[PDB]
């Protein structure tokens, strides 16, 4: 079973993502220039969100020695921990490791205990550290995003063997493309010096780039793989799915948001359950041209509805029907009026939609999955 989240959301003039030169990210979809928000940016925004705070635990750092020292307390051993990691296969540059390590935060205590003892030697300590690190995949974010870890074989102890360090990713996120011709705008700014002086000019002259676009975002969650990655913790998987839905609905990339407060909520969310992943990005091969008698978001939702109906009637007509839930805020933008039956339900509340998804998944109340907390 796959959980497919299709989102149509319009943003205020902003620069959520940019490259080295500072311009908003762009893509060429359908032969025309579009506005792009990278999947990594949406993944980080969802991961570092209030709705996903409880299901954290995965830390991706090159400064593992600092964490080991902080957990161990006032016992020094930072240099010896760094050397243990060095023998394990993580060379340092100056003070941090040369490569990032993804690991559960609950095993920092195990690493600190393993480092702190004096009975263990150096090869044994490195082997134990590697064993602990490779087995720390219980965090929900590690389950969703995955992990790969290739230690430096050349700069590693000969008598240190690594177990399997990769975890399958249960979440697939596509780059957020725009539904129309994305035109960029240049903002001419100036920095003013408060001190009058004698120049009577400006502190700095520069060029800022921003763009506003209606974005189509696609998410895919593998329920069986998410359950397997958590070792059968079905309740934790349901909590992860619900909090992921709430986050993806309720948080935005934090890029230049102090000057571009683009905090717009999605105008329509389609949640569909199927055994194969289907992306409705081809609904917007034609860039949406705004007409006077309609609205850009309404036109995008109508095109999406037409493509969804075409896909349902031409690809998913079997003995197994596809059940999908359509969410709009207070049913502001429904699906196409020509069908009015594409979605199984038309929910007007985000919490109700989350509850419906959880109930359909395996039968799950939001309260009884939020109730799993440590205190």
- Binding to a copy of itself (CB under 8 A): which residues in 116-135? none
Q: 44-63: which residues touch a copy of itself (CB under 8 A)?
A: 44, 50, 58-63
Residue 250's closest CA among 63, 7, 35? 7
Instruction: Pick one of 1, 40, 76, 321: the residue that binds a copy of itself (CB under 8 A).
Output: 40
Helix, coil or strand: residue 14: strand
- In the complex, the smallest distance separating the C-beta of residue 352 from a copy of itself, rounded to whole angstroms, is 9
Site for a copy of itself in 179-198 (CB under 8 A): 180, 183, 185, 187-189, 191-195, 197-198
Angstrom distance (rounded) from CA 167 to CA 144 = 9
- DSSP three-state, residue 188: strand
> Could you tell me the sign of the dihedral formed by the alpha carbons of 62, 65, 66, 68, in that order?
positive
Nearest approach in angstroms of CB 192 to a copy of itself is 7
Token pair 């700095």 is found at 204
Return the closest-CA partner of residue 145 out of 47, 25, 268, 246. 47
Q: What whole-number distance in Å separates Cα of residue 264 and Cα of residue 250?
A: 9
Interface stretch with a copy of itself, choices 115-123, 132-140, 287-295, 337-345 (CB under 8 A): 287-295
Pick the piece of the chain touching a copy of itself (CB under 8 A) from 82-90, 119-127, 210-218, 235-243: 210-218
Cβ 369 to a copy of itself shortest distance, Å: 15
Among 79, 332, 338, 371, binds a copy of itself (CB under 8 A): 332
State the minimum distance, in angstroms, from the CB of residue 374 to a copy of itself. Answer: 20
Q: Please, is 7 exposed, middle or buried when counting C-beta atoms within 10 Å of its C-beta (0-12, 13-18, 19+)?
A: buried
Closest CA to 104 of 76, 130, 141, 79: 141
Which listed range, 85-93, 206-214, 223-231, 358-366, lies at the site for a copy of itself (CB under 8 A)? Answer: 206-214
Bridge partners of residue 218, in order along the sequence = 6
For 61, the token pair is 């750092």
Residue that has been written with the tokens 């219980």 in this structure = 138
> According to CB under 8 A, which one of 339, 348, 356, 360 is a site residue for a copy of itself?
348
Site string for a copy of itself, 84-103 (x = CB under 8 A): ------------x--xx---
What is the DSSP secondary structure assignment for residue 280, as one 8-state letter?
-
106, 285, 338, 340: which one contacts a copy of itself (CB under 8 A)? 285
* Token pair recorded at residue 71: 């957990």
Four-point Cα dihedral 95, 96, 98, 103, nearest 10: 160
The number of residues that bind a copy of itself (CB under 8 A) is 115
Among 73, 149, 72, which residue's Cα sits nearest to residue 114? 72
Neighbours of 205 (CB within 10 A): 10
Binding residues among 306-325 for a copy of itself as defined by CB under 8 A? 307, 309-311, 313-318
Asked if 304 and 8 count as a contact pair (C-beta separation under 8 A), the reply is yes
Beta carbon of residue 170, minimum distance to a copy of itself (angstroms, whole number): 9
For residues 130 to 159, the per-residue mask of contacts with a copy of itself, x marking binding by CB under 8 A and - elsewhere, is: ---------------xx-------------
Choice between 120 and 356, CB closer to a copy of itself:
356
Least separation, in Å, of the C-beta of 121 and a copy of itself? 26
Q: Which C-beta is closer to a copy of itself: that of 29 or that of 364?
A: 29
User: Is position 370 an interface residue for a copy of itself (rule: CB under 8 A)?
Assistant: no
3-state secondary structure of 309: helix
Contact segment (CB under 8 A) with a copy of itself among 111-119, 120-128, 232-240, 303-311 equals 303-311
Per DSSP, the three-state class of 371 is coil
The contact pattern for a copy of itself, residues 234-273, with x = CB under 8 A and - = no contact, is ---------------xxx-----xxxxxxxxx-x------
């Amino acid at each position: 079973m796959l959980i497919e989240i299709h989102m149509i959301q319009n943003h205020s003039p902003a620069n959520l993502n940019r490259d080295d030169l500072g311009a908003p990210k762009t893509c060429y979809f359908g032969g025309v220039l579009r506005s792009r928000i990278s999947s990594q940016c949406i993944k980080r925004s969802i991961r570092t969100s209030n709705d996903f705070k409880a299901l954290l635990g995965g830390v991706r750092t090159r400064r593992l020695a600092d964490l080991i020292q902080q957990e161990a307390g006032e016992t020094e051993c930072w240099k010896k921990a760094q050397e243990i990691l060095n023998k394990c296969g993580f060379k340092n540059k100056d003070d941090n490791t040369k490569m990032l390590v993804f690991m559960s935060k609950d095993k920092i205590k195990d690493l600190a205990r393993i480092v702190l003892d004096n009975s263990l030697g150096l090869t044994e300590a490195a082997q134990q550290v590697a064993n602990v690190i490779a087995q720390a995949t219980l965090a929900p974010d590690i389950a969703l995003c995955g992990r790969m870890l290739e230690p430096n074989d050349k700069d590693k102890d000969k008598k240190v063997k690594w177990s399997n360090t990769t975890v399958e990713a249960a979440l697939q996120v596509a780059h957020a493309i725009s539904t129309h011709i994305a035109r960029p705008e240049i903002d001419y700014f100036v920095a003013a010096d408060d001190v009058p002086g004698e120049d009577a000019g400006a502190g700095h002259i520069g060029e800022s780039m921003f763009a506003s676009a209606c974005f189509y975002k696609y998410f895919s969650i593998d329920w069986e793989q998410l359950v397997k990655n958590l070792k059968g913790d079905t309740n934790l998987a349901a909590h992860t799915v619900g909090a992921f839905l709430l986050a993806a609905a309720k948080t935005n990339p934090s890029g230049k948001q102090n000057s571009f407060a683009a905090h717009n909520y999605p105008d329509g969310i389609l949640v569909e359950f199927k055994n194969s992943p289907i992306s409705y990005a081809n609904a917007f091969v034609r860039p949406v041209s705004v007409v006077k008698e309609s609205d850009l978001v309404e036109q995008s939702i109508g095109q999406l509805s037409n493509y969804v109906n075409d896909i349902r009637l031409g690809y998913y007509d079997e003995q197994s029907p596809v059940i999908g839930f359509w969410f709009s805020p207070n049913n502001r933008y429904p699906l196409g009026y020509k069908h009015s039956k594409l979605a199984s339900r038309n929910i007007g509340n985000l919490n109700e939609l989350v509850g419906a998804v959880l109930d359909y998944i395996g039968g799950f109340k939001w309260e009884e999955v939020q109730k799993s907390k440590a205190y």
